[model samples]
Target chain A: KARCSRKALHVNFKDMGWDDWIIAPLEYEAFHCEGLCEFPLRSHLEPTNHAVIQTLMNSMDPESTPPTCCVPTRLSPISILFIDSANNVVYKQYEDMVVESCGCR
Target chain B: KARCSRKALHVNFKDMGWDDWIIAPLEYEAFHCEGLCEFPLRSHLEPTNHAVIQTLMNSMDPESTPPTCCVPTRLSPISILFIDSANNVVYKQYEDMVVESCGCR
Candidate 1:
């Protein structure tokens, strides 16, 4: 099984054709989660009791029980300064834009 | 409303009358969450898109939309060195024993 971890993911507003409105920090590192949750879970994987039990059941019956998922365990926010429709300078923070950590759930 | 935060909590096996079999580390710090997640969410609270929207709706119609919940955002493991029923020295690591951070979800 692929080990669960946080991988690098850069967000480029210029590449996405948003540089005109997004003034500051045209690019940012927004990490993402990529991996699988398998048997004999590790403590670092941050598995809940239900996840542990589900993994066990999945191992026993692959078709019946679905495997645990590797998802964002912790998320961080990103602040952006942009121009709104009214031509106003807007500085705002967005939640769950960056994955700080990953876990099995 | 009470802000979301992690509160200190100590686990004492001796106080729980479990010091007989369970050996090393008779006590440990097992923090818990005790707070309310209400309107005007902060970035540190780690809210999802749905949580943000729900909070907005809750503010408009308190009877319809439910408030967000403060929960464990990040968790760490606790390693224990103890004795099993067969008088065997067992070392194990348990997950989600310690809450590292809290968030509104």
Candidate 2:
């Protein structure tokens, strides 16, 4: 079986206000040149937590591949928020997971 | 005209997080037994500022009339939120205004 990869999902960190509003960044493994055991990879996202996945492109590329692959695939982040009767705020949790492999190490 | 009454809008009191979410409460002139210039007259909202109108409504009444009325129709509040790249939170403002007249009250 070929070692396929890439994964993404919502992270649980902030209490609420912003967690769902930001699209975070993560990294995985690639066999061609780049790379995960949490080692064959590196991730750097401009977004800190939950905001909007609009960090780079304001809209979905509708062109990216799914984040799980033997090749670089799909990647984007989406979040949520809630308001109480007191008008208080609570950011909801979102989960995005990806596992991709560039192939041929 | 028959001297109708009503009016509603977003109040810019808080910074953000709660403004766009809460469906506020406002009171307009009720000819028969109740009340504007600020005496049309009393407003009591369960929401303090902004959160989500998903309050007692869980969702919009889909049946409530628009806040601008004659026999007293339409009432609901909606809000907004913004998250920075740092995942920082910034509540956005939402404006919801309703002007109604319950004929004999």
Candidate 3:
């Protein structure tokens, strides 16, 4: 069965008067979900990295070619401070997931 | 009891490969018209600050409360590069404004 899950939304450096204003979708292979991962999530991944799996779950699009894992064809709504050159926060707010086929028998 | 005017668009440091990316509205009291003024346009005012008047004219919005001056409510559309650390430009491309009721009466 092919099941999917989403990781918790984490935002660092929020205490410094930064607001959640922007969101961007990212994807990765499903075999790399493991230890700690950082933003811009390293492009390369290995089987031990489970975080990669989490990223793939969050960014998979239903309409695409060959059903590839991590295609950069999606764009999400992003909010950001208009000005204020001091504090700028850029992140993604994953809405939800739709699992049409679970690949379960 | 007042008249509105728009200021000329100016962008510095444009030769450094920074594109016309973002824009933000700013307001200041008229009368302090004169000399060079950097960003965030010093809150204080004097007869020699023409830039203050210029900033005020550019930021006047139509719908508002008593319509005093520099209300700081209206928001405008701005464009910016997604995520390239090397170059980031922030400026405004002012669209035409409607003068339903001019204070020149």
Candidate 4:
């Protein structure tokens, strides 16, 4: 697979972070094979509401780029990178999973 | 830090495993520095109330070792490895984190 050039990205978490959701597995596989993922898979978004969105706003840098409109899913370690103002590379592997169902899920 | 030799331990999740919970940071830091973590930290267990324990029992190999009495925590990727009958390694880095609190956490 071809790696995305680190230069072409806007590296800001409060801006372009997947702080809101995770990528589903099949979509992740597809996007991973094509290149670096620029958007979250639309189909596999799991559970989220106002609290999560609010948390996203609070946790990230407000000056960051506006995120691409996509959905969250059931996967962890969403690897992301961007170029910061200081010309440094910012890489993140978001590794949090949310199990929506209580039992038999 | 030195890596564990990957020997000198029994390999079984349904048997000897930290399947019940994640390792807390301080204890995990200590165990990670010392070597492979054989037992879950005593003080860092998160919220497991019979259901999680039953899930552990349900998810693992029944022939597995009796678990050491310990606690779970809010960390993820509990890397564990065990040897099976055919000499294949059953390594598991448990990536599930249980957040006890909803809004704050």
Candidate 5:
């Protein structure tokens, strides 16, 4: 798997400081060379709503390029980041990072 | 501040099972020698509704001691426990337990 230099920002409810965020893709074979699965797979497929898009947009700085449009699917893999700005300084943080790939039976 | 024996349980949405939970107190000054705080302090202080209490009650076993009544306050420190029952066996869990203390200055 190739490492991607993706970053985002978020406000920590506990601490009032900015942190740097980064997420790297994991190899598909890591989870038994198959996609992750659990019973009661989601019942419905829906598009990402405005609220989520708004969240993503807010996380990005207006001075930088906007994020790519996210495709809707039952199992879309992606990573999330959080950046905090305090005293004119910025920091990035990352969590719940995931990757996307076509599955093979 | 004194260390206390406290525990609670929670159901992790990602993982399906029970896990032991334990929480201990830090010296009062741990969060700057006073107490934890962040602005936009809660707007209102009201009694916890039945739903929250019900969650706490359900997490505990019928055989163990029922939890003490929790007083409603802007800042009430308490710990939680999470116990999982799988294959007819049981487990314990805990999270976010806080303590109570009168502040000085």
Candidate 6:
């Protein structure tokens, strides 16, 4: 509902019925990207060349091209400890699991 | 020298004097990304959102922002066989070592 920003969304492994094999950090904040890539794109929006062109085309003909999307520009990794199929405990970092910043894409 | 495009830049392990350790594939086409991310960005340029804004800002005030760069959009891996520090003959694939496509970024 705001210009592309990070919104928090807490994820509970147990709530999603994924805690059976997952260990530690029962719940964590997993932010999401939101907002609109409107006309007269701003510098902070990080509008891509295609997005700018698309926006321009859209302004000329609303149905000519679809509006650009606000998406995660940067993401951080999250560490997870879980039991594998072999019943071995695997602790690893999952990349791009947490949104760090948002931008037009 | 032109709009964003993949250009030829063959890499010869032997020419680089790396043949002493490198084995097989004496030379390979290691294409590179090149060209300009100029104004009135074309659709084929595949400009990124940030690149679009940067190009516009630069156009409005030539000194305000830097021109978007033509960089690698997609890259492929290349297999190299060579001698390791441990004196072992190592053969492995290197990711993003060969440029496949170029775009504005």
Off by more than 4 A, model 6: A85-87, B1-105
Encode model 2's per-residue lDDT on B1-105: one tens digit a residue: 333333222233243244444333222221110121121322332111111111112123423311111222222333345455676665654332222222211
Per-prediction TM-score, chain B alone: 0.89, 0.23, 0.22, 0.23, 0.15, 0.81
Better of 1 and 6 by TM-score: 1
lDDT of each: 0.68, 0.26, 0.24, 0.26, 0.22, 0.63
Judged by DockQ relative to the true structure, which candidate is superior, 5 or 6?
6
The stretch of ten residues in a row with the least summed lDDT in candidate 3 chain A is A96-105
Q: Candidate 1 on A13-52: residue-level lDDT in tens?
A: 6755676688987878765555777966878887885466
Higher-scoring candidate on TM-score, 2 or 4: 4
Ranking by lDDT: 1, 6, 4, 2, 3, 5
Order of models, best TM-score first? 1, 6, 4, 2, 3, 5
* Predicted complex 4: CAPRI docking category: incorrect
Interface quality of candidate 4 as DockQ: 0.02
DockQ list for all candidates: 0.08, 0.01, 0.01, 0.02, 0.01, 0.02
Per-residue lDDT of candidate 5, residues B1-105 (tens digit) = 221111121222222121242222211210101221111122221212221222233244423212212121112333333333354332332221222221110
Better by lDDT, candidate 4 or 3: 4
Candidate 5 ranges beyond 4 A from true positions: A1-105, B1-85, B102-105
Query: Lowest summed-lDDT stretch of 10 residues in model 4 chain B?
Result: B26-35
- Model 3 Cα lDDT, one tens digit per residue, A1-105: 222212122222232233443232222111111122223353342211222222332334322101112211112322332323455553433221211111100
Which candidate number maximizes TM-score? 1
Clashing pairs in 1: none
By TM-score, is 2 or 5 better?
A: 2
TM-score of chain A of 3: 0.21
Could you say which candidate leads in lDDT? 1
Task: Give TM-scores of chain A for all candidates.
Answer: 0.89, 0.21, 0.21, 0.24, 0.15, 0.82
